[PDB]
Amino acid sequence: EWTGDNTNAYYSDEVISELHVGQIDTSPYFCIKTVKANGSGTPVVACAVSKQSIWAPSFKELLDQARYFYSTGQSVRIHVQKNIWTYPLFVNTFSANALVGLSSCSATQCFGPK
Amino acid sequence: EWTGDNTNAYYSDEVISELHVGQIDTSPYFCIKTVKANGSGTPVVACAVSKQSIWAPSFKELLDQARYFYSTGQSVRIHVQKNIWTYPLFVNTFSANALVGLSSCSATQCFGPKL
Amino acid sequence: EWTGDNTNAYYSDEVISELHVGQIDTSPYFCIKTVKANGSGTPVVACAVSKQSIWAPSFKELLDQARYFYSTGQSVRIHVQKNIWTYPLFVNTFSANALVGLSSCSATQCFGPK
Amino acid sequence: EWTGDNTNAYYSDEVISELHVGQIDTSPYFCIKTVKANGSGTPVVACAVSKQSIWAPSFKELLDQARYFYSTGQSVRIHVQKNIWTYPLFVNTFSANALVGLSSCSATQCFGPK
Amino acid sequence: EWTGDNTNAYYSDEVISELHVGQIDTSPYFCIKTVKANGSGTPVVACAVSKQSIWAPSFKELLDQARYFYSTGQSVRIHVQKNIWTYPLFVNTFSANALVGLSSCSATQCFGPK
Numbered sequence: 360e361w362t363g364d365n366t367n368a369y370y371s372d373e374v375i376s377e378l379h380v381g382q383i384d385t386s387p388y389f390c391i392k393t394v395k396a397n398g399s400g401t402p403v404v405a406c407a408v409s410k411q412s413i414w415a416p417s418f419k420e421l422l423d424q425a426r427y428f429y430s431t432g433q434s435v436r437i438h439v440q441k442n443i444w445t446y447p448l449f450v451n452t453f454s455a456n457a458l459v460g461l462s463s464c465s466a467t468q469c470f471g472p473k
Numbered sequence: 474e475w476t477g478d479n480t481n482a483y484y485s486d487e488v489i490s491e492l493h494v495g496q497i498d499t500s501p502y503f504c505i506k507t508v509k510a511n512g513s514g515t516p517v518v519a520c521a522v523s524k525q526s527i528w529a530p531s532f533k534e535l536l537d538q539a540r541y542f543y544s545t546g547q548s549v550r551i552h553v554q555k556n557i558w559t560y561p562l563f564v565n566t567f568s569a570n571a572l573v574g575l576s577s578c579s580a581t582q583c584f585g586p587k588l
Numbered sequence: 589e590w591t592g593d594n595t596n597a598y599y600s601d602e603v604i605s606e607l608h609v610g611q612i613d614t615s616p617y618f619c620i621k622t623v624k625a626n627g628s629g630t631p632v633v634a635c636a637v638s639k640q641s642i643w644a645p646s647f648k649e650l651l652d653q654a655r656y657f658y659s660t661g662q663s664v665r666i667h668v669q670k671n672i673w674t675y676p677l678f679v680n681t682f683s684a685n686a687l688v689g690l691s692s693c694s695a696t697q698c699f700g701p702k
Numbered sequence: 703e704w705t706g707d708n709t710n711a712y713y714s715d716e717v718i719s720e721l722h723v724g725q726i727d728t729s730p731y732f733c734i735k736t737v738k739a740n741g742s743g744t745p746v747v748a749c750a751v752s753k754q755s756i757w758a759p760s761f762k763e764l765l766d767q768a769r770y771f772y773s774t775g776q777s778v779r780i781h782v783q784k785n786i787w788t789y790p791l792f793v794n795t796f797s798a799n800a801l802v803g804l805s806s807c808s809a810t811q812c813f814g815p816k
Numbered sequence: 817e818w819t820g821d822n823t824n825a826y827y828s829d830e831v832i833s834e835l836h837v838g839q840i841d842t843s844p845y846f847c848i849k850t851v852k853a854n855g856s857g858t859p860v861v862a863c864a865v866s867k868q869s870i871w872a873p874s875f876k877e878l879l880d881q882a883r884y885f886y887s888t889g890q891s892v893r894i895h896v897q898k899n900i901w902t903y904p905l906f907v908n909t910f911s912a913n914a915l916v917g918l919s920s921c922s923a924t925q926c927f928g929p930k
């Protein structure tokens with residue numbers, strides 16, 4: 360598996376606009392909401408769950424990176440795998456998107472798979 | 474269990490106004506106090522205690538997050554489960570509320586579960 | 589045991605003014621010095637030692653929190669247990685106080701046991 | 703093995719211009735892009751991958767240090783070992799360079815093996 | 817053993833001017849260079865190696881503290897134990913000094929053993 364798999368979706372020139380931390384089924388988790396830096400379009404919501412999905416090993420690193428980018432408000436590319444979370448109220452509140460990557464973005468390109 | 478279970482209480486548009494760190498019964502713990510950003514209502518107090526309650530696994534992540542939201546002073550939704558801490562002096566000083574989640578807020582919403 | 593036990597001692601309206609990190613007997617440790625925000629009184633010194641005393645489990649969290657308040661320079665209440673550390677040169681250099689808690693203080697009250 | 707082995711390569715007076723965090727084959731990883739402080743030259747890309755390659759033990763420290771240097775934008779020397787990552791799409795997106803060290807380049811020169 | 821043993825050396829009113837992070841023999845390490853706040857005398861170079869020396873258990877705490885002091889630029893007392901590291905290229909690049917402690921300094925005295 361890889362962040363950059365073409366079966367994963369990504370969204371460039373985004374800003375992390377919201378951050379949530381909580382717990383589900385004995386596992387800490389977090390979610391982020393991202394929006395286009397220019398405000399156009401629909402927000403992306405994605406979550407990471409410490410002990411769930413093939414992406415569990417990256418939980419700490421993505422949490423830290425989300426916090427960092429959230430603190431700077433800089434443009435990023437967000438990478439997700441769709442249809443991963445399955446608890447219905449959790450998906451309703453957030454989404455089924457698993458967060459699988461974050462890339463810094465310049466004016467012209469983003470530093471990550473495309 | 475889940476932060477967003479409807480058996481948990483939550484309070485929107487709060488600012489973390491105080492922070493305490495200590496130890497009880499072999500466990501490091503932290504407590505926070507929050508007040509409505511607009512001045513209304515009653516302060517909320519909640520604590521997380523390492524290795525204690527069903528919420529133990531999120532202690533570290535919640536501590537870090539509390540420290541962050543505290544440092545920025547931004548508006549948040551605080552999620553608690555009531556009547557969890559039972560040590561009477563501790564409860565009297567702080568509360569029985571376990572801290573089970575923290576959500577950033579916008580002008581119209583907070584990014585987390587609600588009823 | 590609890591930070592708020594009345595057999596512990598606390599001091600309000602203080603600022604963490606100094607910070608030291610080292611090692612003793614295979615254990616990392618840190619110490620802090622606090623002084624009254626208003627310049628009155630006598631400094632408080634306390635240490636925490638990674639694998640020593642009943643307070644060992646809180647070492648990391650106390651260190652992080654000491655660092656936090658030290659960086660903000662805000663008014664705090666420091667909670668100690670007296671006469672814990674016993675290595676004479678160590679005590680001479682710092683004190684026998686074990687650091688057992690830290691509370692933020694507003695102008696008229698502190699958020700912690702009293 | 704050592705960061706300073708002459709079989710490794712390094713580049714001085716660089717600035718970390720981009721940062722990416724992801725996961726590949728069960729491992730969180732990060733990549734950085736660096737460019738000359740004065741704008742010349744060709745970018746340098748390097749990655750560190752958790753629990754992969756002989757440089758795995760330093761993953762956390764290198765991640766933290768990359769973040770630090772990325773946040774300040776200060777001049778640095780980046781140390782790599784070439785031809786370590788083999789996953790082809792990953793290499794095409796980033797590079798095969800393992801990140802093996804980071805040095806500040808402040809006053810006299812770069813503070814690290816040369 | 818202790819940071820404050822009289823068989824250790826220390827240097828007061830030093831500013832951390834350089835920072836390096838890398839790996840040697842499967843072990844992360846960092847090194848710092850410090851100079852007198854008034855720019856007199858000779859720089860001090862000291863390293864900490866995870867998994868090596870008796871000071872190994874304090875590695876993370878020292879790295880963290882070095883980073884902090886390095887970012888503030890404040891004057892500190894550096895505690896070292898001499899003649900510890902043995903790999904000649906390493907010693908030649910850096911020094912044989914093991915970092916054993918870091919103390920904040922007021923205008924008149926440092927908060928550490930002397």
Ligand SMILES: CC(=O)N[C@H]1[C@H]([C@H](O)[C@H](O)CO)O[C@@](O[C@H](CO)[C@@H](O)[C@@H]2O[C@@](O[C@@H]3[C@@H](O)[C@H](O)O[C@H](CO)[C@@H]3O)(C(=O)O)C[C@H](O)[C@H]2NC(C)=O)(C(=O)O)C[C@@H]1O
Binds near residue numbers: 599693696698
């Ligand atoms: C180990 C111990 O004895 N801890 C005490 C601690 C200690 O006496 C001093 O902090 C050491 O300097 O004091 C604690 O209570 C203080 C007393 O100073 C607070 O009530 C604090 O008091 C202030 O006004 C005081 C008077 O109350 C006192 O009688 O006289 C002094 C002058 O010598 C002051 O005028 C003060 O110190 O400014 C008012 C201030 O608002 C009070 N702080 C708070 C948070 O309410 C303490 O440090 O909390 C009690 C502790 O058990």
Ligand SMILES: CC(=O)N[C@H]1[C@H]([C@H](O)[C@H](O)CO)O[C@@](O[C@H](CO)[C@@H](O)[C@@H]2O[C@@](O[C@@H]3[C@@H](O)[C@H](O)O[C@H](CO)[C@@H]3O)(C(=O)O)C[C@H](O)[C@H]2NC(C)=O)(C(=O)O)C[C@@H]1O
Binds near residue numbers: 711715
């Ligand atoms: C993998 C590899 O080749 N690593 C080299 C590295 C590399 O060639 C370049 O960094 C790629 O851009 O270069 C290293 O050595 C550099 C040379 O650039 C230092 O000597 C650096 O050189 C400066 O002046 C140089 C000349 O010395 C050189 O011959 O030609 C260039 C022309 O562009 C410059 O005029 C410079 O680049 O500014 C002087 C500067 O002070 C030097 N920096 C330091 C820290 O000494 C390197 O990047 O360290 C060597 C490495 O092995």
